[PDB]
Amino acid sequence: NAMKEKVVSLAQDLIRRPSISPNDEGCQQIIAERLEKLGFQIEWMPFNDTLNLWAKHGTSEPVIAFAGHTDVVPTGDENQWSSPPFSAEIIDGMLYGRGAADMKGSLAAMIVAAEEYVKANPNHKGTIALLITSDEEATAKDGTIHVVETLMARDEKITYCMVGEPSSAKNLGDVVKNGRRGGGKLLDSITSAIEETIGITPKAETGTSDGRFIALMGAEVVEFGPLNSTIHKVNECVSVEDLGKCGEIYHKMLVNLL
Ligand SMILES: [Zn+2]
Ligand SMILES: [Zn+2]
């Protein structure tokens, strides 16, 4: 529950930053500061008006990357909101705010999971990476695609990539996303982690453009994350209990995988 608490605190810190695309508003800095403290190598890839982060712990393959974005969609009229959109207020077990579901809650859970994992296993096989962009929700010409190009140009590999977009439809863990728009161990690892943590089996469905670009590297790409019912809406929120479970699920995934 200590870990749950860390996930929630980080999510609030992120939510409070009004990172309307492509403006990062310091979210990637918060994130890089925490990881750097645990021995992660920090690489900044800014391009035009977009901020991108590539953070890695480890040297060897397999390379497992967590990918996500710090940007959020406009709020709409504030008179429609019960809590102000960037307040990160917790009401009857729900964390409210623009970004809470899409995707700052899940971003916080991936981060806490990577940290927890590295703290327990500093000599872990393979490499744990985070790939974070400030522009997924708008035009995205200079976001994840820039990072992918940069990595490909120097023959740097990603084996597996967990895209922390909110994938759950009715109940947390009910839906995982994989495959191609037009028709491995990662899928296995996340499926088991979900089963083991919350006792249900996800349905694999056939998808963000961002995931789509990472897949061009020949990474196995899977999307998993919280309930998506409230994304891009007023009074966007996410269950704190769910954030807690996400943390556990991601950590378990790494265990399973590495
Ligand atoms: Zn979105
Ligand atoms: Zn998103």
XYZ file of C-alpha atoms in Angstrom, residues 2-243:
242
model
C 3.139 2.058 0.348
C 3.576 1.546 -3.415
C -0.053 2.432 -4.146
C 0.531 5.685 -2.293
C 3.569 6.443 -4.370
C 1.634 5.876 -7.630
C -1.150 8.213 -6.455
C 1.213 11.007 -5.310
C 3.068 10.924 -8.617
C -0.151 10.921 -10.629
C -1.338 14.038 -8.742
C 2.000 15.785 -9.299
C 1.634 15.118 -13.048
C -2.082 15.999 -13.235
C -1.388 19.398 -11.637
C 0.786 20.344 -14.672
C -1.476 21.666 -17.500
C 0.349 19.942 -20.265
C -1.868 20.706 -23.185
C -0.163 19.355 -26.294
C 2.769 19.831 -27.034
C 3.711 21.713 -23.878
C 5.269 19.303 -21.303
C 4.982 21.758 -18.385
C 7.800 19.991 -16.518
C 6.239 16.566 -16.267
C 9.181 14.781 -18.010
C 11.625 16.546 -15.669
C 9.820 15.204 -12.549
C 9.918 11.799 -14.073
C 13.635 11.959 -15.175
C 14.684 13.263 -11.711
C 13.182 10.195 -9.977
C 14.683 7.646 -12.465
C 18.115 9.297 -12.550
C 18.266 8.822 -8.777
C 17.952 5.058 -9.299
C 20.706 4.828 -11.893
C 18.714 5.291 -15.065
C 20.570 6.873 -17.993
C 18.636 9.972 -19.091
C 18.505 11.067 -22.723
C 16.617 14.179 -23.899
C 15.331 14.288 -27.413
C 13.618 17.754 -27.967
C 12.505 18.581 -31.462
C 10.704 21.782 -32.464
C 8.053 22.427 -29.752
C 7.931 18.817 -28.464
C 9.905 17.319 -25.500
C 10.834 13.585 -25.619
C 12.539 11.356 -22.983
C 14.419 8.136 -23.489
C 15.491 6.652 -20.057
C 17.196 3.274 -19.713
C 18.413 0.971 -16.836
C 20.564 -1.919 -17.887
C 22.774 -2.766 -20.871
C 21.897 -6.120 -22.363
C 18.953 -7.203 -24.519
C 16.005 -7.867 -24.130
C 14.937 -4.269 -23.976
C 11.482 -3.730 -22.436
C 10.231 -0.138 -22.920
C 7.241 1.490 -21.182
C 5.843 4.111 -23.526
C 3.370 6.954 -22.934
C 2.717 10.631 -23.183
C 2.647 13.566 -20.819
C 0.351 15.722 -22.922
C -3.307 16.121 -22.420
C -6.348 17.269 -24.518
C -8.141 20.641 -23.861
C -10.443 20.808 -20.827
C -13.467 22.540 -22.336
C -15.465 25.096 -20.328
C -14.513 24.987 -16.634
C -18.200 25.539 -15.582
C -18.763 21.903 -16.667
C -16.201 20.558 -14.191
C -17.065 19.602 -10.575
C -13.422 19.868 -9.523
C -11.104 22.196 -11.442
C -9.435 20.130 -14.220
C -5.896 20.452 -12.922
C -6.674 20.195 -9.215
C -5.892 16.416 -8.915
C -8.501 16.159 -6.188
C -9.418 12.784 -4.721
C -13.221 12.365 -4.083
C -14.786 9.097 -2.814
C -11.850 6.979 -4.088
C -11.653 8.734 -7.505
C -8.716 10.850 -8.665
C -10.171 13.643 -10.799
C -8.548 15.656 -13.544
C -7.701 16.143 -17.151
C -5.070 13.438 -17.738
C -6.043 11.231 -14.789
C -7.190 8.380 -17.108
C -5.335 9.431 -20.273
C -2.686 8.861 -19.268
C -0.961 10.326 -16.239
C -2.357 7.709 -13.710
C -0.964 4.847 -15.808
C 2.254 6.688 -16.595
C 2.762 7.039 -12.823
C 2.006 3.305 -12.298
C 4.635 2.264 -15.033
C 7.218 4.505 -13.507
C 6.658 3.258 -9.920
C 6.719 -0.345 -11.183
C 10.110 0.168 -13.064
C 11.575 1.811 -9.925
C 10.336 -0.892 -7.536
C 11.659 -3.562 -9.881
C 15.122 -1.973 -10.279
C 15.407 -1.386 -6.549
C 14.818 -5.133 -5.886
C 16.930 -6.291 -8.859
C 19.693 -3.895 -9.766
C 21.606 -6.605 -11.579
C 18.579 -7.567 -13.690
C 18.907 -9.216 -17.094
C 18.151 -6.998 -20.062
C 17.194 -3.349 -20.107
C 14.155 -1.450 -18.710
C 13.444 1.717 -20.652
C 10.880 4.544 -20.641
C 9.891 6.359 -23.825
C 7.780 9.484 -23.042
C 6.658 12.213 -25.455
C 4.891 15.592 -24.925
C 2.890 15.229 -28.166
C 0.761 12.190 -28.708
C -2.655 13.880 -28.716
C -2.152 16.481 -31.406
C -0.252 16.278 -34.738
C 2.590 14.205 -33.220
C 5.092 14.901 -36.086
C 7.910 15.377 -33.580
C 7.047 13.019 -30.741
C 7.435 9.254 -30.482
C 8.237 9.080 -34.235
C 11.346 11.294 -33.691
C 12.518 9.034 -30.842
C 11.917 5.917 -33.060
C 13.945 7.491 -35.960
C 16.810 8.459 -33.607
C 17.011 4.976 -32.119
C 16.769 3.287 -35.536
C 19.523 5.554 -36.948
C 22.027 4.231 -34.397
C 20.834 0.624 -34.544
C 19.371 0.710 -31.010
C 16.794 -2.062 -30.364
C 13.495 -2.369 -28.551
C 12.362 -5.981 -28.005
C 9.129 -5.441 -26.149
C 7.045 -2.348 -25.552
C 4.168 -1.811 -23.065
C 2.077 1.188 -24.054
C 0.308 2.393 -20.921
C -2.756 3.836 -22.721
C -6.080 3.192 -20.902
C -7.294 -0.069 -22.540
C -9.852 -1.404 -20.046
C -13.522 -1.207 -21.230
C -15.807 -2.282 -18.246
C -13.495 -3.607 -15.595
C -9.769 -3.080 -15.015
C -7.777 -5.746 -16.867
C -10.713 -6.883 -19.102
C -8.924 -5.690 -22.355
C -5.378 -5.768 -23.672
C -4.506 -4.303 -27.199
C -2.008 -5.810 -29.695
C -1.388 -6.362 -33.455
C -1.653 -4.199 -36.560
C -4.351 -1.725 -37.612
C -4.795 -3.443 -40.997
C -4.444 -6.988 -39.713
C 4.980 -13.459 -27.667
C 6.511 -13.220 -24.166
C 5.160 -9.660 -23.620
C 1.490 -10.652 -24.198
C 2.072 -13.735 -22.002
C 3.735 -11.660 -19.307
C 0.979 -8.979 -19.060
C -1.811 -11.545 -19.295
C -0.476 -13.542 -16.372
C 0.266 -10.433 -14.354
C -3.359 -9.297 -14.725
C -4.699 -12.803 -13.858
C -2.383 -13.107 -10.831
C -3.177 -9.599 -9.504
C -6.904 -9.145 -10.029
C -8.078 -12.606 -11.019
C -9.478 -12.069 -14.483
C -8.209 -12.976 -17.946
C -7.881 -10.201 -20.508
C -9.296 -10.349 -23.967
C -6.666 -9.399 -26.621
C -8.164 -6.889 -29.178
C -6.814 -5.554 -32.530
C -4.225 1.138 -31.105
C -2.404 4.412 -30.964
C -0.333 5.735 -33.775
C 2.570 5.934 -31.237
C 2.485 2.161 -30.510
C 2.173 1.815 -34.285
C 5.531 3.551 -34.838
C 7.353 1.594 -32.087
C 6.136 -1.614 -33.801
C 8.079 -0.543 -36.939
C 11.272 -1.231 -34.868
C 10.159 -4.819 -34.752
C 9.173 -4.581 -31.062
C 6.313 -6.670 -29.773
C 3.909 -3.907 -28.741
C 1.023 -4.382 -26.277
C -1.314 -1.730 -24.760
C -2.633 -2.052 -21.232
C -4.043 0.477 -18.840
C -7.018 1.704 -16.754
C -10.656 2.287 -17.658
C -11.025 4.482 -20.658
C -14.723 5.564 -20.240
C -13.843 9.086 -19.048
C -10.996 9.950 -21.451
C -11.350 13.239 -23.323
C -14.423 14.163 -21.279
C -15.246 16.613 -18.619
C -14.703 15.258 -15.035
C -12.161 12.757 -16.349
C -11.127 10.492 -13.452
C -9.524 7.347 -12.356
C -9.907 4.932 -9.474
C -7.054 5.146 -6.926
C -7.575 1.475 -6.079
C -7.225 0.809 -9.867
C -3.940 2.879 -9.984
